[PDB]
Design an enzyme around this catalytic site. Structure first.
Site, PDB file in Angstrom:
ATOM      1  N   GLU B 152       0.827  -1.203   0.000  1.00  0.00           N
ATOM      2  CA  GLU B 152       0.000   0.000   0.000  1.00  0.00           C
ATOM      3  C   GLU B 152       0.867   1.261   0.000  1.00  0.00           C
ATOM      4  OE1 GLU B 152      -2.974  -2.651  -0.260  1.00  0.00           O
ATOM      5  OE2 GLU B 152      -2.789  -0.522  -0.771  1.00  0.00           O
ATOM      6  N   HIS B 155       1.958   1.818  -3.346  1.00  0.00           N
ATOM      7  CA  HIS B 155       1.025   2.545  -4.195  1.00  0.00           C
ATOM      8  C   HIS B 155       1.156   4.030  -3.861  1.00  0.00           C
ATOM      9  CE1 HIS B 155      -1.032  -0.549  -6.346  1.00  0.00           C
ATOM     10  NE2 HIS B 155      -1.596  -1.106  -5.291  1.00  0.00           N
ATOM     11  N   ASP B 234      24.206   3.261  12.297  1.00  0.00           N
ATOM     12  CA  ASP B 234      23.318   2.120  12.108  1.00  0.00           C
ATOM     13  C   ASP B 234      23.288   1.743  10.634  1.00  0.00           C
ATOM     14  OD1 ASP B 234      20.020   1.254  13.389  1.00  0.00           O
ATOM     15  OD2 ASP B 234      21.096   0.419  11.667  1.00  0.00           O
ATOM     16  N   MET B 286      24.679  29.892  -1.417  1.00  0.00           N
ATOM     17  CA  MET B 286      26.121  30.065  -1.294  1.00  0.00           C
ATOM     18  C   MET B 286      26.763  28.693  -1.116  1.00  0.00           C
ATOM     19  SD  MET B 286      28.358  32.382   1.407  1.00  0.00           S
ATOM     20  CE  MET B 286      27.974  34.004   0.711  1.00  0.00           C
ATOM     21  N   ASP B 288      28.676  25.690   0.227  1.00  0.00           N
ATOM     22  CA  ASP B 288      28.889  25.327   1.613  1.00  0.00           C
ATOM     23  C   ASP B 288      30.219  24.614   1.792  1.00  0.00           C
ATOM     24  OD1 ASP B 288      26.238  26.282   2.412  1.00  0.00           O
ATOM     25  OD2 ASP B 288      25.507  24.573   1.235  1.00  0.00           O
TER      26      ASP B 288
HETATM   27 CA    CA Z   1      24.427  26.709   0.641  1.00  0.00          CA
HETATM   28 CA    CA Z   2      18.654   2.500  14.936  1.00  0.00          CA
HETATM   29 ZN    ZN Z   3      -2.591  -3.089  -4.756  1.00  0.00          ZN
END
Ligand code: CA
Ligand code: CA
Ligand code: ZN
Ligand SMILES: *[C@@H]1O[C@H](CO)[C@@H](O[C@@H]2O[C@H](CO)[C@@H](O)[C@H](O)[C@H]2NC(C)=O)[C@H](O)[C@H]1NC(C)=O
Ligand SMILES: *[C@@H]1O[C@H](CO)[C@@H](O[C@@H]2O[C@H](CO)[C@@H](O)[C@H](O)[C@H]2NC(C)=O)[C@H](O)[C@H]1NC(C)=O
Ligand code: CA
Ligand code: CA
Ligand code: 3CO
Ligand code: ZN
Lengths: 426, 426
Positions: B152, B155, B234, B286, B288
Site C-alpha cells: 500500500e 502505491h 546504524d 552560497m 557550503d
Molecule cells: Ca548553501
Molecule cells: Ca537505529
Molecule cells: Zn494493490
C-alpha cells in the site's frame, strides 16, 4: 485373526463425525457484523474439511452451528491452553445439554500467544469432556483455516504430529507440526496408523451413528458422498461414481431405480419385503428384515429376558449385561465379582451401599434386592486382602452401581434397584 | 530524456517516510486487550518494512502510534474503498492537526470483502488528503502483513501492480497483484522504474525532511538504518551491513572512525576544514564548506537583502520570493499581479483585507504597508471582468497573503505585515 470379530466389525463400519461449530464474538466483528458472512465462511471451511476426511473413511457432518454475535459464552483469551479448557467445559455443561454432537470446534478471531493456531485434546473424540478443539482464523485463505481445523480434529482422533520420516507426498501433511501455505489436504502414512491403532484400542462408539439428513445444517453439496436434504443419492463426482443407480451430476436417482445405497436395495430396486438385510451379530440380536417400501434396514434385537452367555445373563436392549464383565470394566483384567456376603453392605443404605434414591435420599436394599445396588468387586490376585471393594464417583453416584438388566439370580435381573422376574416385560 | 539540475538534486537526496500507524478496536480485542502486544505487533511490522524500503533509498521512521482501544474514530467496514475514504478524511482532519507526518496506515483486524488485504491511494504520498492506506492484519505471520503494508505504501509512492513480465527474482515481488505466502521482500524492476518516474515528475517534498531523533516513537533498534537515541551509527543487521565505519552489532563507530555518513564524511573521517560539500544551486544560495569537525554540511545562503531575479526580488532565507511567482503558485499560469489600486482593500481590516493578526483580531494595513497583506492577482483570460482576485482558505487564513521577505518597494520587503527597508538585518 489379531482383532476380535467385534474390532474387525467396528473398523469396517462407516464412520461419521457429527460436528458442531462455534464462531466467537471477534469472528462476528471481523466479518462486519454480518451473520450471513460468518456463516458462509464456516460452510466453506466445512466444504474443505469433508473431502479431507473422506480419505480416512470418515464423513464430517455439520450438525450444529452457533455464532456468539451477542457476546462470548466463555472467556476466549490469548492463551490457547486456557481457552481450550474453558471451551471444553462449556461444551460439557451447556452445549451437550441441548444439542447432541460428537465433536465441537471453536473458530475464534483472536490471536493465540505463540506460533500455534489451534489446540485440541489428543484422542478426545466422542468424550463428553474432551472431544473439542479451538482454531484461530489465522489466514484470509479459508482452505488454510480448514486444514488447521482438520489438524485439531486430527489430534481429537488420536493422531500425533508427523515426524521427520512421515510422508503423504512432496508437500506437508495435515498433521504437520507447524504452519505453512504449502499445506496439502492429505494425511501422512503415520497418521493413518496412529488413527487406526487408536480406534482398535478405543473403539469410540459415537462416530458409528449416522446423522439424519435433517440434522445437517450445512447447505447440501452434491458429490460429497452423503445424501442431504434435496438429494436422492450421492455417489461422488461423475468421475468416481460407482453406483449405476445414481446420476452423480444431479444427485437424483436414474429413471427406474427406487433406491441406490443401502442394505435393502438390489439392482436399483427395493429388496423383497421380508428379506434379510443384516444377520444377527450375537445371541442377543435378531436378524433384520426389509419392509419392501423402505431403503434402510432398521436394527432390532431379541426380546429382553432371553437367556445369554451360557445362562450367566439375560438380554437387555441388545446386550448381555453381566456382573463379571462390569467388574472387569471398572477395575481391569483379573477383576472378579465379590462373594455374596459382600453385597449385604447394600442393606445399609449408607453413603455407598444402597439400591436407589428417592430424590437424593439413598434407600437401602431389601434382603432380596441386595444384588442390585452397589457392585462389589475383588481384583483376583495374591496381593489384595479385601474381599469387598466398590467403584465410586463424586460426580455421579450411579456410576459403579450394578447395571440395569443384570442377572441377579435365576430368572431375575435388576430393574430399578430391584431383582425381578425376566418373564415380566422390561 | 534529459534531467534538470533540480531533478537530479531531488533524486540524490536521502529520503525518509515519517510514518504514523493506527490500530482499530478489533486489533485491540484480537490481541487480548493487551496494548503491549498490539504495539509489539506494530513494531515487528515496521521492522520488516524498513529493510524493505532502505533498498529503495527510503528510510522509514515511525513518528506516531495510535491504538483505538476505546472506540474507533471512524466506522471500520468490510468494504475497503469506504474504509480508506473515511480513514484518509479522519487523517486530514483529526490527525494532521495534532501531528505532522508523511503517510499514515490503518492496521485493522476486520476482513475486507473480496481477496484483497489492503487499499491505498496511487501516488498520494505527502498529500494531506491521499497520503494514506489501510492494511488487514490478514495473517498470523506478521512478515506477510508487513509486505501487504509495504504494498500500500508502495502505491502511495507511485507504484502499480506488477505484470507477468516484471521480476525481482524467483518469488513474487512486493507489488504483486495478489496475495501469496511466498511473497518476497523485493521490488520488481517495473516498480523501481515507475517509482523513479513518479519522483522526477512529482518531487514530493515531505520525504526530504529527516525526522528528529526525538520524533521517533518506536523503541530504538540497532540495525534499522536510522541513528536513534544512544546510537552513533546504524547500517542495518550485522549480516547485511557493509559499512567499514560502523559496528553493526553495537551501533557504535569502529576504532579510528569519526563518522559513518554525511556530506563531510569520507572513509570514516571528517573532511578537511574548508572543503566544499555543496555547490550553490542559485543566486540566493552560497557554496557550503566542511568544518573539519563535523560530518554534516550546514546549508548556508546569501545574506538576506541580496538583489535577485533581475532586481525584482531580494533574497530571503535561500529563496527569492516575488509577487509574480506567488500569483502563479496560487492561481496557475497566466495569473499576474493586480494593479496597485487593488491592494487598497487591505486597509479594510476586515475578512480578507488586512496586514496581520494580533491574536484572533486582524489588523489593517497602513497606507505604507498596503502591499504586504493579502496578495491580489487576476487571470489572463479575455473573459475575465474582475481586476482584483484573492486566494482564501478558511482553514488557514494566512494562505494567500504576501510571503515574508517579498519585495514590496524599490528597496524594501515585507516583514510582519509591514514594508520595511532591506538595509536592515532581517
Ligand atoms: Ca548553501
Ligand atoms: Ca537505529
Ligand atoms: Zn494493490
Ligand atoms: C453480508 O455478507 C454477504 C456474503 O458475505 C453479502 O452477500 C454477497 O453480496 C454480493 C454482492 O455484493 C454477492 O455477489 C454475493 O453472492 C453475496 N453472498 C452471498 C452468497 O450471500 C451481503 O451483501 C452482506 N450484507 C451486508 C449488508 O453487509
Ligand atoms: C501482553 O503482551 C505481551 C507481548 O508483547 C506479553 O509480554 C511478553 O512479550 C514478549 C515479546 O515481546 C514475549 O517473549 C513474552 O513471552 C511475553 N510475556 C509472556 C511470558 O507472556 C505479556 O505477557 C502480555 N500480558 C498478558 C496479560 O498476557
Ligand atoms: Ca451430498
Ligand atoms: Ca438385528
Ligand atoms: Co541509508
Ligand atoms: Zn498439533
Amino acid at each position: 485373526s489379531n482383532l476380535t470379530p467385534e474390532q474387525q466389525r467396528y473398523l469396517n463400519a462407516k464412520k461419521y463425525v457429527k460436528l458442531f461449530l462455534v464462531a466467537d464474538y471477534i469472528m462476528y466483528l471481523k466479518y462486519g457484523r454480518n451473520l450471513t458472512a460468518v456463516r458462509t465462511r464456516m460452510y466453506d471451511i466445512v466444504n474443505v474439511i469433508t473431502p479431507i476426511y473422506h480419505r480416512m473413511n470418515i464423513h464430517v457432518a455439520l450438525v450444529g452451528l452457533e455464532i456468539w454475535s451477542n457476546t462470548d459464552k466463555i472467556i476466549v483469551q490469548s492463551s490457547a491452553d486456557v481457552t481450550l479448557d474453558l471451551f471444553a467445559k462449556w461444551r460439557a455443561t451447556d452445549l451437550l445439554s441441548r444439542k447432541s454432537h460428537d465433536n465441537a470446534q471453536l473458530l475464534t478471531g483472536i490471536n493465540f500467544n505463540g506460533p500455534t493456531a489451534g489446540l485440541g485434546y489428543l484422542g478426545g473424540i466422542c468424550n463428553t469432556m474432551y472431544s473439542a478443539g479451538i482454531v484461530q482464523d489465522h489466514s484470509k485463505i479459508h482452505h488454510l483455516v480448514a486444514i488447521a481445523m482438520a489438524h485439531e480434529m486430527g489430534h481429537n482422533l488420536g493422531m500425533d504430529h508427523d515426524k521427520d520420516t512421515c510422508t503423504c507426498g512432496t508437500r506437508p501433511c495435515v498433521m504437520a507440526g507447524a504452519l505453512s501455505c504449502e499445506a496439502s489436504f492429505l494425511f501422512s502414512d503415520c497418521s493413518q496408523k496412529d488413527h487406526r491403532e487408536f480406534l482398535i484400542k478405543n473403539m469410540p462408539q459415537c462416530i458409528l451413528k449416522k446423522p439424519l439428513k435433517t440434522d445437517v445444517v450445512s447447505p447440501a453439496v452434491c458429490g460429497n458422498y452423503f445424501v442431504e436434504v434435496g438429494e436422492e443419492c450421492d455417489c461422488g463426482s461423475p468421475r468416481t461414481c460407482r453406483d449405476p443407480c445414481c446420476d452423480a451430476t444431479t444427485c437424483k436417482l436414474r429413471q427406474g431405480a427406487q433406491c441406490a445405497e443401502g442394505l435393502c436395495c438390489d439392482q436399483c430396486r427395493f429388496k423383497g419385503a421380508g428379506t434379510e438385510c443384516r444377520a444377527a451379530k450375537d445371541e442377543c440380536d435378531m436378524a433384520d428384515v426389509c419392509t419392501g417400501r423402505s431403503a434402510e434396514c432398521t436394527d432390532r434385537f431379541q426380546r429382553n429376558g432371553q437367556p445369554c452367555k451360557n445362562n450367566n445373563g439375560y438380554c437387555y436392549n441388545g446386550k448381555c449385561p453381566i456382573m463379571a464383565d462390569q467388574c472387569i470394566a471398572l477395575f481391569g483384567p483379573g477383576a472378579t465379582v465379590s462373594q455374596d456376603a459382600c453385597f449385604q453392605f447394600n442393606r445399609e443404605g449408607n453413603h455407598y451401599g444402597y439400591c436407589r434414591k428417592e430424590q437424593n435420599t439413598k434407600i437401602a436394599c431389601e434382603p432380596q434386592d441386595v444384588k442390585c445396588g452397589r457392585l462389589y468387586c475383588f481384583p483376583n490376585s495374591p496381593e489384595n486382602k479385601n474381599p469387598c471393594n466398590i467403584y465410586y464417583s463424586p460426580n455421579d453416584e450411579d456410576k459403579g452401581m450394578v447395571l440395569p438388566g443384570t442377572k441377579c439370580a435365576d430368572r431375575k435381573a435388576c430393574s430399578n434397584g430391584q431383582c425381578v422376574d425376566v418373564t415380566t416385560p422390561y
